[PDB]
């Protein structure tokens, strides 16, 4: 759903992005976080994953810059060293809690992927474990090769994202939909521009066919850039121009915000692209903010390195990077507060 | 298209809709205008069609309310009683001239329609006859019955509109795309809401796949209402709420304006729906204006009736209705100037 139900979804979306805030994605599966851990010599125990999250969530002052945190499902069952549920660290700070609800990717046609997990999504939305969650996330990933992303893969993934979106909303959760364009490929920036415009517009088609409440959806999107294996160079301004044009061409006025993923880009580049895009002229209604994992927490991992002695310095790096991303979400990174 | 080419398209779009202005559609084919003529006893001669248009275009002061006029192709070859090309009447007033470029509709599947004319559209855009035109229009029509509009018909028409759009733009013309939802059918307002959201979102998909410059496209859309053969009642406020929600859900920030078609609705209702929609709250970047034929000119035809003695009163009705539509495009119809 009724009017009040819809207004709640809208309000939650706006509360997450208030005052130049963005999202800390901490939702990595054990496998994804494990690979980052192993590179740095940190063993992939549940204990180390729990401690990492606690390090993140207990950072003093983070709520000034972070409007929501995306949790992995295992993290909802976990407590701090002090016995306090990790979700309580975020509730006391007034930060919105989110749950990543996709169950990963499986192969689709030749060389491509779809995301999976819809068949019990409604059930999982109602779980008592996620009672404090007010938003969710679900990721699809688009590989780029010649002739790919195929139109079938775009349609299928967009349809999955949209079905996820409506199920979340009927359960009182604001969905973040993440149609990630995978950086690791060989493709020009021009091609990325064009395909981003195919994906984002088709996504909005599917959201609309499912009668999703658009003011209650957040879009988690890749910057428009060339692929890592390309020898094409770009700058923050060109990324800002191309990404903003793609978004003005495809995202309706009713969407409350776009939250960029860092995607394998520098922390530095992900934040500078955000600032640059927020300096661009071009009337729009949605906020342009962030939903970073790597851009926000790579520095924490590198500083911490499984050594508790390094934790404070790790938290200070998170707070400093969070500040920069928040300034950048308002186009003020060049300006002194 | 280059940067300058695109900025021209954008500027033209904005010039048409400046200061609460809208579009006078005068583009009816001989067959469409003939049927309106016959109802009122006026013979369907070329001379009478020429005189009607002259009556419209020579109305004193119309340029205050009308930013562009859509002409039928035959009208580009026609002169006033005084020997002045009819297009010069509009050029001297500073009104933008447009050309309707579709060649009508043919049958599609069972009970539905597609619009036609793409195969020589590029050629026709370059014709010397349309040299003074700076915009164009192309209409598709969506019949409603059970199970219809079909997804095939939505895709095909949206694809035709988008191909038209890019051809126009490559020729320096701002395209108006008109995905009309036909009023004459039996369907609820709720169903019209849902299908409008299917059509508008799919349209934006196709515009994006064709890499159309979105700030240089105008959308000519039906109000969301129940069908004429329905016994469902609505009011201006409900139409405003439903139509605005459909548009916020589907139309990107980059579109410069939506221009409503009157569609068989009252002149009174078409203008009151416009005013109502412009009184609604909900952040948006595009103007909400009009591209009326019937709502603006039915009164002229009824007053004139093929009798030159009635012409001045006919022109005064056009100027008065134009004023009302302009006030309504700014949400000021209740307010005294």
mmCIF file of C-alpha atoms in Angstrom, chain A residues 119-232:
data_model
loop_
_atom_site.group_PDB
_atom_site.id
_atom_site.type_symbol
_atom_site.label_atom_id
_atom_site.label_comp_id
_atom_site.label_asym_id
_atom_site.label_seq_id
_atom_site.Cartn_x
_atom_site.Cartn_y
_atom_site.Cartn_z
ATOM 1 C CA UNK A 119 13.369 -19.882 -6.116
ATOM 2 C CA UNK A 120 13.594 -19.350 -2.328
ATOM 3 C CA UNK A 121 14.202 -15.568 -2.289
ATOM 4 C CA UNK A 122 10.783 -14.833 -0.833
ATOM 5 C CA UNK A 123 11.398 -17.320 1.991
ATOM 6 C CA UNK A 124 14.885 -15.901 2.699
ATOM 7 C CA UNK A 125 13.546 -12.305 2.815
ATOM 8 C CA UNK A 126 11.266 -13.428 5.671
ATOM 9 C CA UNK A 127 14.125 -15.129 7.695
ATOM 10 C CA UNK A 128 14.521 -13.960 11.288
ATOM 11 C CA UNK A 129 18.289 -13.734 10.674
ATOM 12 C CA UNK A 130 17.650 -10.682 8.381
ATOM 13 C CA UNK A 131 15.006 -9.012 10.631
ATOM 14 C CA UNK A 132 17.111 -5.852 11.053
ATOM 15 C CA UNK A 133 17.914 -5.592 7.304
ATOM 16 C CA UNK A 134 16.134 -2.762 5.468
ATOM 17 C CA UNK A 135 17.748 -3.256 2.061
ATOM 18 C CA UNK A 136 19.292 -5.893 -0.114
ATOM 19 C CA UNK A 137 21.682 -6.472 -2.980
ATOM 20 C CA UNK A 138 21.883 -8.894 -5.905
ATOM 21 C CA UNK A 139 24.664 -9.000 -8.473
ATOM 22 C CA UNK A 140 24.768 -10.048 -12.130
ATOM 23 C CA UNK A 141 28.045 -9.932 -14.030
ATOM 24 C CA UNK A 142 28.447 -9.203 -17.756
ATOM 25 C CA UNK A 143 31.562 -10.627 -19.419
ATOM 26 C CA UNK A 144 32.835 -8.871 -22.561
ATOM 27 C CA UNK A 145 34.356 -10.702 -25.524
ATOM 28 C CA UNK A 146 33.601 -10.305 -29.241
ATOM 29 C CA UNK A 147 29.856 -10.614 -29.764
ATOM 30 C CA UNK A 148 29.266 -10.535 -25.991
ATOM 31 C CA UNK A 149 27.320 -9.528 -23.840
ATOM 32 C CA UNK A 150 24.719 -11.293 -26.020
ATOM 33 C CA UNK A 151 21.165 -9.870 -26.141
ATOM 34 C CA UNK A 152 19.924 -13.150 -24.495
ATOM 35 C CA UNK A 153 22.265 -12.617 -21.531
ATOM 36 C CA UNK A 154 21.228 -8.985 -21.136
ATOM 37 C CA UNK A 155 17.527 -9.931 -21.150
ATOM 38 C CA UNK A 156 17.876 -12.876 -18.842
ATOM 39 C CA UNK A 157 20.005 -11.056 -16.250
ATOM 40 C CA UNK A 158 17.827 -7.969 -16.365
ATOM 41 C CA UNK A 159 14.785 -10.154 -15.887
ATOM 42 C CA UNK A 160 16.392 -11.866 -12.866
ATOM 43 C CA UNK A 161 17.332 -8.511 -11.346
ATOM 44 C CA UNK A 162 13.764 -7.230 -11.789
ATOM 45 C CA UNK A 163 12.161 -10.332 -10.271
ATOM 46 C CA UNK A 164 14.501 -9.990 -7.311
ATOM 47 C CA UNK A 165 13.566 -6.339 -7.033
ATOM 48 C CA UNK A 166 9.813 -6.920 -6.759
ATOM 49 C CA UNK A 167 10.223 -9.809 -4.310
ATOM 50 C CA UNK A 168 12.420 -7.622 -2.068
ATOM 51 C CA UNK A 169 9.984 -4.758 -2.196
ATOM 52 C CA UNK A 170 6.926 -6.909 -1.407
ATOM 53 C CA UNK A 171 8.974 -7.931 1.681
ATOM 54 C CA UNK A 172 9.702 -4.346 2.803
ATOM 55 C CA UNK A 173 13.294 -4.343 1.485
ATOM 56 C CA UNK A 174 14.769 -1.747 -0.845
ATOM 57 C CA UNK A 175 16.609 -3.677 -3.537
ATOM 58 C CA UNK A 176 19.943 -2.669 -4.935
ATOM 59 C CA UNK A 177 20.296 -4.161 -8.432
ATOM 60 C CA UNK A 178 23.898 -4.614 -9.620
ATOM 61 C CA UNK A 179 24.323 -5.153 -13.359
ATOM 62 C CA UNK A 180 28.129 -5.133 -13.233
ATOM 63 C CA UNK A 181 30.057 -4.690 -16.492
ATOM 64 C CA UNK A 182 33.180 -6.741 -15.835
ATOM 65 C CA UNK A 183 36.365 -4.667 -16.103
ATOM 66 C CA UNK A 184 38.488 -7.709 -16.967
ATOM 67 C CA UNK A 185 38.032 -7.906 -20.679
ATOM 68 C CA UNK A 186 39.195 -6.408 -23.932
ATOM 69 C CA UNK A 187 36.866 -3.689 -25.145
ATOM 70 C CA UNK A 188 37.040 -0.026 -26.001
ATOM 71 C CA UNK A 189 35.473 2.707 -23.932
ATOM 72 C CA UNK A 190 33.115 3.478 -26.792
ATOM 73 C CA UNK A 191 31.900 -0.117 -26.781
ATOM 74 C CA UNK A 192 31.430 0.031 -23.046
ATOM 75 C CA UNK A 193 29.394 3.215 -23.429
ATOM 76 C CA UNK A 194 27.131 1.509 -25.971
ATOM 77 C CA UNK A 195 26.677 -1.707 -24.044
ATOM 78 C CA UNK A 196 26.086 0.085 -20.725
ATOM 79 C CA UNK A 197 23.253 1.901 -22.503
ATOM 80 C CA UNK A 198 21.869 -1.451 -23.714
ATOM 81 C CA UNK A 199 22.046 -2.967 -20.204
ATOM 82 C CA UNK A 200 20.718 -0.022 -18.178
ATOM 83 C CA UNK A 201 17.795 0.599 -20.543
ATOM 84 C CA UNK A 202 16.843 -3.082 -20.689
ATOM 85 C CA UNK A 203 17.110 -3.229 -16.887
ATOM 86 C CA UNK A 204 14.622 -0.363 -16.597
ATOM 87 C CA UNK A 205 12.380 -2.263 -19.054
ATOM 88 C CA UNK A 206 12.318 -5.298 -16.828
ATOM 89 C CA UNK A 207 11.869 -3.318 -13.587
ATOM 90 C CA UNK A 208 8.841 -1.725 -15.245
ATOM 91 C CA UNK A 209 7.363 -4.988 -16.539
ATOM 92 C CA UNK A 210 7.504 -6.295 -12.950
ATOM 93 C CA UNK A 211 5.764 -3.082 -11.690
ATOM 94 C CA UNK A 212 8.616 -2.338 -9.340
ATOM 95 C CA UNK A 213 8.289 0.840 -7.315
ATOM 96 C CA UNK A 214 11.013 2.811 -8.986
ATOM 97 C CA UNK A 215 11.500 5.363 -6.198
ATOM 98 C CA UNK A 216 12.422 2.362 -4.028
ATOM 99 C CA UNK A 217 15.217 0.888 -6.167
ATOM 100 C CA UNK A 218 18.943 1.670 -6.070
ATOM 101 C CA UNK A 219 21.144 0.925 -9.082
ATOM 102 C CA UNK A 220 24.654 -0.318 -8.518
ATOM 103 C CA UNK A 221 26.524 0.339 -11.724
ATOM 104 C CA UNK A 222 29.947 0.159 -13.334
ATOM 105 C CA UNK A 223 31.738 3.245 -14.483
ATOM 106 C CA UNK A 224 31.963 3.477 -18.279
ATOM 107 C CA UNK A 225 35.590 2.749 -19.095
ATOM 108 C CA UNK A 226 37.616 0.620 -21.457
ATOM 109 C CA UNK A 227 38.495 -2.920 -20.382
ATOM 110 C CA UNK A 228 41.643 -3.722 -18.424
ATOM 111 C CA UNK A 229 43.148 -5.712 -21.325
ATOM 112 C CA UNK A 230 42.622 -2.844 -23.725
ATOM 113 C CA UNK A 231 45.493 -0.466 -24.408
ATOM 114 C CA UNK A 232 43.025 2.416 -24.417
#
